[PDB]
Amino acid sequence: KKVTVEDLFSEDFKIHDPEAKWISNKEFIYRERKGSVILRNVETNNSTVLIEGKKIESLRAIRYEISPDKEYVLFSYNVEPVYQHSHTGYYVLSKIPHGDPQSLDPPEVSNAKLQYAGWGPKGQQLIFIFENNIYYCAHVGKQAIRVVSTGKEGVIYNGLSDWLYEEEILKSHIAHWWSPDGTRLAYATINDSRVPLMELPTYTGSVYPTVKPYHYPKAGSENPSISLHVIGLNGPTHDLEMMPPDDPRMREYYITMVKWATSTKVAVTWLNRAQNVSILTLCDATTGVCTKKHEDESEAWLHRQNEEPVFSKDGRKFFFVRAIPQGGRGKFYHITVSSSQPNSSNDNIQSITSGDWDVTKILSYDEKRNKIYFLSTEDLPRRRHLYSANTVDDFNRQCLSCDLVENCTYVSASFSHNMDFFLLKCEGPGVPTVTVHNTTDKRRMFDLEANEEVQKAINDRQMPKIEYRKIEVEDYSLPMQILKPATFTDTAHYPLLLVVDGTPGSQSVTERFEVTWETVLVSSHGAVVVKCDGRGSGFQGTKLLQEVRRRLGFLEEKDQMEAVRTMLKEQYIDKTRVAVFGKDYGGYLSTYILPAKGENQGQTFTCGSALSPITDFKLYASAFSERYLGLHGLDNRAYEMTKLAHRVSALEDQQFLIIHATADEKIHFQHTAELITQLIKGKANYSLQIYPDESHYFHSVALKQHLSRSIIGFFVECFRVQD
Amino acid sequence: LKSHIAHWWSPDGTRLAYATINDSRVPLMELPTYTGSVYPTVKPYHYPKAGSENPSISL
Amino acid sequence: NRAYEMTKLAHRVSALEDQQFLIIHATADEKIHFQHTAELITQLIKGKANYSLQIYPD
């Protein structure tokens, strides 16, 4: 049969995984398909049912955060994640494997939702934040202790974060990851007291409804006062702040990193407003002094500060990722080791890897084998492979995911705490499958799951064609994928649906197996689809990063049009049904590319679209507005170029759509209102569908369905050949 | 009144009626501001939302 | 308010199946606010009908 929308969202397609996380040296948890959570040691392979398939249902919970002690079970029901990573709900501490449902409440309080639920990464001390105030329970049965209280809802938060940061720096709820020992609580008290409030559309609600005031600073507007506070939750709850270091370039900073090296040595970064200088400073839980160890400086802007320097088990050597030269082709990320000398500002840095590609993050520093494990792009910028590497005397390159896991160039690892074993969960380009391993001898112990009923399910549907090529631009070899039907033919003339991403720093072109609306169109209605990574694509150099400084959106049209430039020369693409696409800036690129009139042809596309597109940065927050175009107010020049009012009057009759949501949280709705006016003016044809009060990630699924089918229900009418 | 003109002279120019309308208690309806600038500055002008109050007028 | 209830479009917006819709509403309506429209795109998208959008910013 043809793959449809309900197909994508049928449980028969549920690519499953056992949700593992390593608490001990050799034991790894793993979910059963019937809710009964199971813990598996690597060596002994023992499978334990402390959690039956039922208690998750009767409690409706989805989070189980067991303290590393395996004594109790934290639960979480009525959980409505407000953000990408956040969540909020009423939570219960119950016992392993059985215990009455005991609500973890603030002292003197009954039945309280908690801004975050979690024990410590050790023992069974816990905190739980409420009304921006962090509580602390020392052990089970104890009345908690509101160890932090300065947070006032809306603006000042404790263990929680503010507008211009937590949706333009972290994107993650967290401001509290404890130490490897758990004697202290890191928490950022960020303060939007000067950052204004976006009375963001609450277009529904009460009988006399209004909009919900929460924060909004603007391009050229201040940031909130972030910090790394560290309360020592054992004995004296001593809060010492990790303070910004000696740099006049750090006037309007951004704490963009928290890792707990050890029980006493900690690090914090400071991302300035220009985002050209940021300083990974080793701070001190016992006094706060952020010992400058390494500082990052790139004239255009700095990249990848959210990545923690994961200091060793001791807290000096922070192997930190920094881009090393790659000969004539420039600066590409390769991990460098930086020992925090006891009294140093500059560290003797020693680069682990090298080559014309970039590395991403230290998953672990293994001082046992000396064979560190890193994920990089040694094979292809579209592939992902875990390797094993020495950091002394060899800088060896040795793979645990090359030639070991079959057609799995999208691999994610979770190491047994003794570094002798690990999960490394596989994703495809086959059907995804689970792989724990034995780090010593590279022989996996057993197969945990493979989405087999899903693997079963694909074997009954039309999987279309895949093809790998490239396009040659002045300096770069731009790769190019294509997706043609299961019944593809060399002669038939097809519509065009070119996809892109657009947003500064991202890459999306991959081999991975994906079951989306894309192939649904290729099968159900015969789509010829194309992708490519070029200028504007991340993970291929700062020359590919920092070229676009003050030049967003513009050169991205040219290289993407260069793709279809090669496309239309070939026969079997229909020149009547032509369209582009993209999201989050591919929407912008879709818009920025749709009206580019051919050198000897009119509207090259018959229609287009744009998925929740970023439009304009003065309509947008401070830090993203000024990350790439020079500081707003100091240099607003590049912003007005990126305006699409500059592009609205170029459209004539090519039916161009936009999708967008109202309560959107990163791509603000007033990226639309302050652009649709311009299409209203230019008297081209716009067309919109907006979502009332629903966020940017569509926490409920049916929205994706409504999103998917509607992109289709449009495209079908667009590609119905007209009389 | 099929007019917003409700202050009625004496037809020879001696007297004048009028209305003392009072919206001091009607709830706040947000008849909003959104565009132009990128920050909103809103105009709460009230509204009868059915079940809310009707106007008292003295001459 | 049964009539007030029975006069809600929810009772009637449901039966919309394939009739092409284009809703005329600009943003800063003083009298019939944008709320009165977004209150409907809830009802439309629940009913899964097709539409485009006719909005002017203020």
PDB file of N, CA, C and O in Angstrom, chain A residues 642-667:
ATOM      1  N   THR A 642      18.070  41.134   5.660  1.00  0.00           N
ATOM      2  CA  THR A 642      17.305  39.921   5.909  1.00  0.00           C
ATOM      3  C   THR A 642      15.801  40.143   5.898  1.00  0.00           C
ATOM      4  O   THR A 642      15.052  39.162   5.934  1.00  0.00           O
ATOM      5  N   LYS A 643      15.339  41.392   5.858  1.00  0.00           N
ATOM      6  CA  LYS A 643      13.906  41.639   5.827  1.00  0.00           C
ATOM      7  C   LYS A 643      13.309  41.060   4.555  1.00  0.00           C
ATOM      8  O   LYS A 643      13.919  41.108   3.484  1.00  0.00           O
ATOM      9  N   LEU A 644      12.110  40.499   4.682  1.00  0.00           N
ATOM     10  CA  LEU A 644      11.447  39.931   3.518  1.00  0.00           C
ATOM     11  C   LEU A 644      10.393  40.867   2.949  1.00  0.00           C
ATOM     12  O   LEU A 644       9.881  40.611   1.854  1.00  0.00           O
ATOM     13  N   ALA A 645      10.058  41.943   3.666  1.00  0.00           N
ATOM     14  CA  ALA A 645       9.447  43.095   3.015  1.00  0.00           C
ATOM     15  C   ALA A 645      10.251  43.487   1.785  1.00  0.00           C
ATOM     16  O   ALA A 645       9.697  43.936   0.776  1.00  0.00           O
ATOM     17  N   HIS A 646      11.570  43.322   1.864  1.00  0.00           N
ATOM     18  CA  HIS A 646      12.441  43.481   0.708  1.00  0.00           C
ATOM     19  C   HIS A 646      12.148  42.443  -0.372  1.00  0.00           C
ATOM     20  O   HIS A 646      12.595  42.598  -1.514  1.00  0.00           O
ATOM     21  N   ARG A 647      11.373  41.404  -0.050  1.00  0.00           N
ATOM     22  CA  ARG A 647      11.133  40.325  -1.002  1.00  0.00           C
ATOM     23  C   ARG A 647       9.661  40.136  -1.350  1.00  0.00           C
ATOM     24  O   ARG A 647       9.347  39.425  -2.310  1.00  0.00           O
ATOM     25  N   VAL A 648       8.749  40.750  -0.594  1.00  0.00           N
ATOM     26  CA  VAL A 648       7.327  40.484  -0.778  1.00  0.00           C
ATOM     27  C   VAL A 648       6.809  40.933  -2.136  1.00  0.00           C
ATOM     28  O   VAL A 648       5.977  40.241  -2.733  1.00  0.00           O
ATOM     29  N   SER A 649       7.269  42.077  -2.642  1.00  0.00           N
ATOM     30  CA  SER A 649       6.743  42.591  -3.899  1.00  0.00           C
ATOM     31  C   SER A 649       7.300  41.855  -5.110  1.00  0.00           C
ATOM     32  O   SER A 649       6.862  42.126  -6.233  1.00  0.00           O
ATOM     33  N   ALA A 650       8.242  40.937  -4.912  1.00  0.00           N
ATOM     34  CA  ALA A 650       8.779  40.123  -5.992  1.00  0.00           C
ATOM     35  C   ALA A 650       7.865  38.967  -6.371  1.00  0.00           C
ATOM     36  O   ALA A 650       8.003  38.420  -7.468  1.00  0.00           O
ATOM     37  N   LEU A 651       6.932  38.591  -5.501  1.00  0.00           N
ATOM     38  CA  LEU A 651       6.024  37.491  -5.798  1.00  0.00           C
ATOM     39  C   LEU A 651       4.863  38.006  -6.639  1.00  0.00           C
ATOM     40  O   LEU A 651       4.379  39.122  -6.424  1.00  0.00           O
ATOM     41  N   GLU A 652       4.415  37.207  -7.608  1.00  0.00           N
ATOM     42  CA  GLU A 652       3.323  37.683  -8.449  1.00  0.00           C
ATOM     43  C   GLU A 652       2.051  36.855  -8.311  1.00  0.00           C
ATOM     44  O   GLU A 652       1.024  37.372  -7.859  1.00  0.00           O
ATOM     45  N   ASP A 653       2.105  35.573  -8.675  1.00  0.00           N
ATOM     46  CA  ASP A 653       0.949  34.692  -8.572  1.00  0.00           C
ATOM     47  C   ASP A 653       1.286  33.260  -8.170  1.00  0.00           C
ATOM     48  O   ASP A 653       0.373  32.435  -8.067  1.00  0.00           O
ATOM     49  N   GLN A 654       2.557  32.933  -7.957  1.00  0.00           N
ATOM     50  CA  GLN A 654       2.893  31.599  -7.484  1.00  0.00           C
ATOM     51  C   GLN A 654       2.339  31.392  -6.079  1.00  0.00           C
ATOM     52  O   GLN A 654       2.787  32.020  -5.116  1.00  0.00           O
ATOM     53  N   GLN A 655       1.348  30.508  -5.966  1.00  0.00           N
ATOM     54  CA  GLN A 655       0.574  30.383  -4.736  1.00  0.00           C
ATOM     55  C   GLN A 655       1.487  29.955  -3.599  1.00  0.00           C
ATOM     56  O   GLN A 655       1.899  28.793  -3.524  1.00  0.00           O
ATOM     57  N   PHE A 656       1.785  30.889  -2.705  1.00  0.00           N
ATOM     58  CA  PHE A 656       2.792  30.708  -1.672  1.00  0.00           C
ATOM     59  C   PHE A 656       2.118  30.669  -0.311  1.00  0.00           C
ATOM     60  O   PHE A 656       1.374  31.588   0.043  1.00  0.00           O
ATOM     61  N   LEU A 657       2.391  29.620   0.450  1.00  0.00           N
ATOM     62  CA  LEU A 657       1.752  29.386   1.734  1.00  0.00           C
ATOM     63  C   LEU A 657       2.735  29.719   2.845  1.00  0.00           C
ATOM     64  O   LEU A 657       3.938  29.831   2.597  1.00  0.00           O
ATOM     65  N   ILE A 658       2.217  29.905   4.055  1.00  0.00           N
ATOM     66  CA  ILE A 658       3.001  29.873   5.283  1.00  0.00           C
ATOM     67  C   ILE A 658       2.166  29.190   6.347  1.00  0.00           C
ATOM     68  O   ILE A 658       0.951  29.404   6.422  1.00  0.00           O
ATOM     69  N   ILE A 659       2.815  28.389   7.180  1.00  0.00           N
ATOM     70  CA  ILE A 659       2.198  27.818   8.365  1.00  0.00           C
ATOM     71  C   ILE A 659       2.866  28.479   9.553  1.00  0.00           C
ATOM     72  O   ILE A 659       4.043  28.843   9.474  1.00  0.00           O
ATOM     73  N   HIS A 660       2.121  28.667  10.635  1.00  0.00           N
ATOM     74  CA  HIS A 660       2.732  29.235  11.819  1.00  0.00           C
ATOM     75  C   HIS A 660       1.781  29.057  12.988  1.00  0.00           C
ATOM     76  O   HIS A 660       0.582  28.903  12.782  1.00  0.00           O
ATOM     77  N   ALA A 661       2.312  29.047  14.207  1.00  0.00           N
ATOM     78  CA  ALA A 661       1.455  28.915  15.375  1.00  0.00           C
ATOM     79  C   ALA A 661       1.439  30.205  16.175  1.00  0.00           C
ATOM     80  O   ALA A 661       2.363  31.016  16.081  1.00  0.00           O
ATOM     81  N   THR A 662       0.389  30.382  16.989  1.00  0.00           N
ATOM     82  CA  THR A 662       0.219  31.627  17.739  1.00  0.00           C
ATOM     83  C   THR A 662       1.109  31.706  18.963  1.00  0.00           C
ATOM     84  O   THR A 662       1.927  32.622  19.063  1.00  0.00           O
ATOM     85  N   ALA A 663       0.983  30.760  19.890  1.00  0.00           N
ATOM     86  CA  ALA A 663       1.714  30.798  21.148  1.00  0.00           C
ATOM     87  C   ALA A 663       3.169  30.405  20.971  1.00  0.00           C
ATOM     88  O   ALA A 663       3.850  30.109  21.954  1.00  0.00           O
ATOM     89  N   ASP A 664       3.648  30.406  19.727  1.00  0.00           N
ATOM     90  CA  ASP A 664       4.993  29.985  19.360  1.00  0.00           C
ATOM     91  C   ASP A 664       6.010  30.582  20.310  1.00  0.00           C
ATOM     92  O   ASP A 664       5.800  31.683  20.820  1.00  0.00           O
ATOM     93  N   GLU A 665       7.120  29.882  20.546  1.00  0.00           N
ATOM     94  CA  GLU A 665       8.021  30.337  21.593  1.00  0.00           C
ATOM     95  C   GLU A 665       9.439  30.609  21.111  1.00  0.00           C
ATOM     96  O   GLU A 665      10.185  31.322  21.789  1.00  0.00           O
ATOM     97  N   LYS A 666       9.833  30.101  19.953  1.00  0.00           N
ATOM     98  CA  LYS A 666      11.110  30.506  19.392  1.00  0.00           C
ATOM     99  C   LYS A 666      10.925  31.248  18.082  1.00  0.00           C
ATOM    100  O   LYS A 666      11.689  32.164  17.777  1.00  0.00           O
ATOM    101  N   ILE A 667       9.964  30.835  17.269  1.00  0.00           N
ATOM    102  CA  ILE A 667       9.731  31.581  16.042  1.00  0.00           C
ATOM    103  C   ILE A 667       8.459  32.396  16.217  1.00  0.00           C
ATOM    104  O   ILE A 667       7.390  32.001  15.744  1.00  0.00           O
TER     105      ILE A 667
END
